[PDB]
Amino acid sequence: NSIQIGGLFPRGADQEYSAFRVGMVQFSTSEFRLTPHIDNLEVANSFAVTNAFCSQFSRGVYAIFGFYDKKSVNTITSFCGTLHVSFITPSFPTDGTHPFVIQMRPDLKGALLSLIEYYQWDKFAYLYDSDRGLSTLQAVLDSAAEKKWQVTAINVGNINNDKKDETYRSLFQDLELKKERRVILDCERDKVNDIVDQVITIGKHVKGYHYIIANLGFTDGDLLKIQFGGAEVSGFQIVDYDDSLVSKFIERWSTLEEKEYPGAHTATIKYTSALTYDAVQVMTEAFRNLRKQRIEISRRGNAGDCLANPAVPWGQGVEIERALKQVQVEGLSGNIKFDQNGKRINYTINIMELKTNGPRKIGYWSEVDKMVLTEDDTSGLEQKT
Amino acid sequence: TNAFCSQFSRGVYAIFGFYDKKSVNTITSFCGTLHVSFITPSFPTDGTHPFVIQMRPDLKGALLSLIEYYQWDKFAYLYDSDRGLSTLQAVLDSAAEKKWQVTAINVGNINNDKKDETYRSLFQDLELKKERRVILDCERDKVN
Amino acid sequence: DIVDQVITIGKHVKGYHYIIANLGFTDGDLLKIQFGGAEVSGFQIVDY
Amino acid sequence: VVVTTILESPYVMMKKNHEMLEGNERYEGYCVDLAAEIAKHCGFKYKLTIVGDGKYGARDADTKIWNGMVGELVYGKADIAIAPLTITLVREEVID
């Protein structure tokens, strides 16, 4: 069956799009076929994000898959809320509840507020990134009032690519004079490797300093350089390599060609590609459940305009989202089930701590049970009293 | 989007309009590529954006100059989200190098129904901490 | 190879002192050890 | 300018008919006539208020709050305290 979908992949993103093909290959069905129409356009310019939304809506697609940014979060969720076309994304979750936009990426606010209380902090910097958003910054500032945390929040994503050395060095000398040992750096994989390399050169990574890479990809960053120094670098990892559904995928990931799927000949996977591969499973399972409980899936694909005065819904699109919310599968990230809003629920984030073996697991955060510290080997084995 | 593309069809020369934190990312992108000038008295853009002209002066410099006059180091900061958060980034970066203990509390997400009970729970949280001096940073309807 | 393993272990904070006892002091990599706070003395035979 | 103080003999005491009077004349004592001799030198009006909890006040260990009369000078419920306030170190760093 000819079912078409839409793509909004950014410029320079390749491992996310290579892991979109692999999910298209494995999760295909002879009963119903997904037809991707992919646009490699800039995700920052909301004019180009608007145009790609209309050209795919002129095709008559039933559900659009793509990424978005702070400069376009309020564009896509406004078009999808009005034109009633569902939207699947691994990008950052919106703060306000938005209908017709499903989010594959788990929210990490309650995990980050659980990890700080686990180490029992009271005074720590927080380097945030504006392009990531200020959503988590609102969480650890509103909860700072209730539990008395002397948070020194410093913007760091405004630092330009030309002059990054003198600004980062003038940054950490400020945290030294306030005696800020504990740092929660929180930014994408671009700005984690540039902060960590300036931590290495300044040498803020001896014993005594503590870090929390507050990304969902903890092994995704460079980790060997920060490892042996003696700085306890905690973090969060959404996909666990010993789940035996994941390690079957890693074998099939590494044994692909580099020239056919760029960025696929790797040992690890980015956390965006893990949710990109999971999202094809959810689009397949919901379209499969759209086929079992059969309805008129076929639509007269002659919308075209996207400037309709007034623009009207189409009521079968609500039936699509009601199937997209009604999904409980297993993937790389874990149990994938949604609420009536669109954020994920009954998911599980692994708290990873960095030891000299490499990444080491100490617990898992969850929604129904806050922070289950796992079975402990009494990590540094104590001398007898 | 439609009203901007509507006036692009009438062939206007300059466009005067307001925006919010939802559509600040829309108009500055549309006016950038379509090369049409835009005039606004709303909150100014954060980074430099082309073709968008602001009639409203920036106050993030004057807020820092007012605080350094009164010699404050321990003040709460009730801010509204819907206006934008560009003032919050200024009084958190300047909270670093001048030894300020800012208690920045968002207030914009409060509903129409239970607004009186949460504000009572809000100012009581500034009585356990005893923050006397409070910067209100919000629109005229959220001031009163 | 020693300096890169000093950088990774982080033996180059303030308190550690080094003397590169070669005649070429600028000849080695020097930007990586510079900002850490380790006083790296040395010897240079040719003066620019 | 509100002169706060605490009710300790002979620094601040009640007079004979304090219901019959109002304001400053409800109180007498050492600091009260000292408060006037500040006012005749510096030139400012004053109104004597008594701190409510009846403590000179020290910093709480956990909440780091000040109670008592130093709790009125730091937190700004009064402008000056002419009273038996013992010069210490923990009170020097918050009020002068």
B27, two tokens: 């108009």
Structure tokens at C47: 């003066």
Query: What whole-number distance in Å separates Cα of residue A169 and Cα of residue B136?
Result: 34
Nearest to A131 by CA among A52, A179, A70: A70
Contact check, Cβ <8 Å, B130/D76: no
Across the interface, do C8 and A230 touch by the CB < 8 Å criterion? no
A129: left (phi > 0), else alpha (psi -120 to 50), else beta?
Answer: beta
Interface membership of A135 toward B (CB under 8 Å):
no
User: How big is chain D by its Cα radius of gyration, in Å?
Assistant: 14
Residue from A254, A243, A253, A248 nearest A276 by CA: A253
Give the CA diameter of chain B.
Answer: 59
Cα separation, A130 vs A140, whole angstroms: 15
Chain A nearest-CA residue for B80: A138
Burial A58-94 (b: 16+ CB within 10 A, else e): ebbbbbbbbbbbbbbbbbbbbbbeebbbbbbbbbbbb
Q: What share of chain B is helix, strand, coil (3-state, %, to 5)?
A: 40, 20, 40
C-alpha–C-alpha distance, residues A34 and A288, integer Å:
11
Q: Which chains does chain C touch, 3 or more C-beta pairs < 8 A?
A: A
Answer for the pair A62, A322: CB distance below 8 angstroms, yes or no: no
Method underlying the structure: cryo-EM
Tell me if A47 and B25 make a contact (CB, 8 A cut-off).
Answer: no
d(CA A26, CA A256): 14
State how far residue B75 is from chain A, nearest Cα, in angstroms. 12
Q: Which residues from chain C sit within 8 angstroms of residue A202, using beta carbons?
A: 35-36
Helix (H) or strand (E) holding B75: strand B74-79
Subunits with 3+ C-beta pairs closer than 8 A to D: B
Q: Return the structure tokens found at A115.
A: 């990890």
Give the bridge partners for A45, in sequence order: none
Beta bridge partners of D3: D48, D80
Tokens of C28: 């080695």
Report the alpha-carbon distance of residue C37 to residue A350 in Å, rounded.
36
CA distances (Å), origin A113, targets A128, A137, A255: 15, 11, 39
Q: Encode burial over D25-41: b for 16+ CB neighbours within 10 A, e otherwise.
A: ebbbbbbbeebeebeee
Cβ separation A229–C37 shorter than 8 A: no
Which residues are within 8 A (CB) of A188 and not within 5 positions of it... i.e. 6 or more apart?
A129, A131, A132, A215
Question: Taking a contact as any Cβ pair under 8 Å apart, which residues of chain B between 44 and 83 contact chain A?
Answer: 81
Helix, strand, coil shares of chain C, percent, nearest 5, are: 25, 20, 55
Q: Are strands A182-185 and A210-213 parallel, antiparallel or unpaired?
A: parallel
| The amino acid at B3 | A
- In Å, how far is D5's CA from the nearest CA of chain B? 21
| Burial bucket for residue B56 (CB in 10 Å: 0-12, 13-18, 19+) | exposed
User: Which residues of D are annotated as part of the binding site for L-glutamate?
Assistant: 84, 86, 91
Q: Do C10 and A202 touch (CB under 8 A)?
A: no
Decide if D43 touches B, using CB distance below 8 A: no
**How far from chain centre, in Å, is Cα A136?**
13
> In 10 A of CB B131, how many CB atoms?
21
Please give the Cα distance from A52 to A59 (Å, whole number): 11
- Cβ <8 Å between B130 and D75: yes
CA-CA distance, A319 to A287, in Å (whole number)?
Answer: 11
Rounded Cα gap, residues A222 and A206, in angstroms: 17
Q: Which of A49, A37, A36 is nearest to A10 (CA)?
A: A49
> How many angstroms from the chain centroid is the CA of residue A107?
8
- Cα(D85)–Cα(A135) distance, rounded to whole angstroms? 47
Can you read off the two tokens belonging to residue B28? Answer: 């500055």
CA angle at residue A308 from A306 to A310, to 5 degrees? 130
CB atoms inside a 10 Å sphere around CB A365: 23
3 state SS of B26: helix
Resolution of this PDB entry, in A?
4.2
**D9: Cβ–Cβ under 8 A, 6 or more apart, which residues?**
D29
